[model samples]
Target: GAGSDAGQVYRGFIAVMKENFGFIETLSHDEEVFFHFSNYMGNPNWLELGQEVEYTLARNGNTSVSGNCLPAENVRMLPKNSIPQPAVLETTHNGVVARPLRCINPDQQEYAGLIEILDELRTTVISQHEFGITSLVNKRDLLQKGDLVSFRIDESGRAACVNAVRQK
Candidate 1:
């Protein structure tokens, strides 16, 4: 009899699925373990094919099945790119002024006003920085608005780190 190793945590990738049930190929064992939406620790709807995941093993003993099958528990999804990267969005800069084209509805006067104020703050911060306006605008021109960018999210779900430097 295989001793219970229910407490052991394992890393694996979603191998394949039929309907709602799927198997995860564990990194340590190189064995495919069964997983179901019922066993998932997080929202199973968020799960995608071939996503990396971490899980704890559970031995199933329903008697209807022969031997022990490793059922995945405590599943957690791992990010494809753990680190943030830059993306492009449409932007315009006229030496002194840099602006992103993405805007809230002009009809929403309150939100629009707030955005305008935010843009003013951004402009003020940029103007005060040591980096010359020409260099900043040039960078903006090269990258353009709507270019691919990766950004770090702060606690408030806002961009904390905007990595806009173009990759050579």
Candidate 2:
């Protein structure tokens, strides 16, 4: 059995799905849909057929479904630019969520804020939290806990901050 957490990339082949549009053939499978994706290189608004793409192969905890699929971070022709990254959370009784990760440094322009969560492509979810709509992109190179972050609600009720400069 091939182990989980295996990481590799292929660059010279195109992924094709069968007539049903429900399945794709990678090596030997005849009728399974295979998703091609990328890693670390964020999402793009479009996908093209026959485009040369890059991606990672990982096992997402299901035995009945196809095992090789592309990840959002690792896909074809990702944009070389950065976008506004946000993370939103509901107000808790204590007005905070536990530190999700670790270490934000102010000298390095680290900041934080509340943003919405988005849906995830790889998993089955019974609740909304099962999806992650909000994403946090760290442009400042440093992050920490207990840092106060501020936001302004736009005309569309979306919160956006200044162009992500780091502050202590």
Best by TM-score: 1
lDDT of 2: 0.30
After TM-score superposition, the amount by which residue 154's alpha carbon in candidate 1 deviates from its true location, in angstroms, is 37
Model 2: per-residue Cα lDDT over 16-103, one tens digit each: 3223221121222122224433232443334323334455444455444443343322444423222222343432111111243114
- Residue 156's lDDT in candidate 1: 15
For model 2 the TM-score comes to 0.24
* TM-score (all chains, Cα) for each model: 0.39, 0.24
Worst 10 contiguous positions by lDDT, candidate 2: 126-135
Q: Which ten residues in a row have the lowest lDDT in candidate 1?
A: 109-118
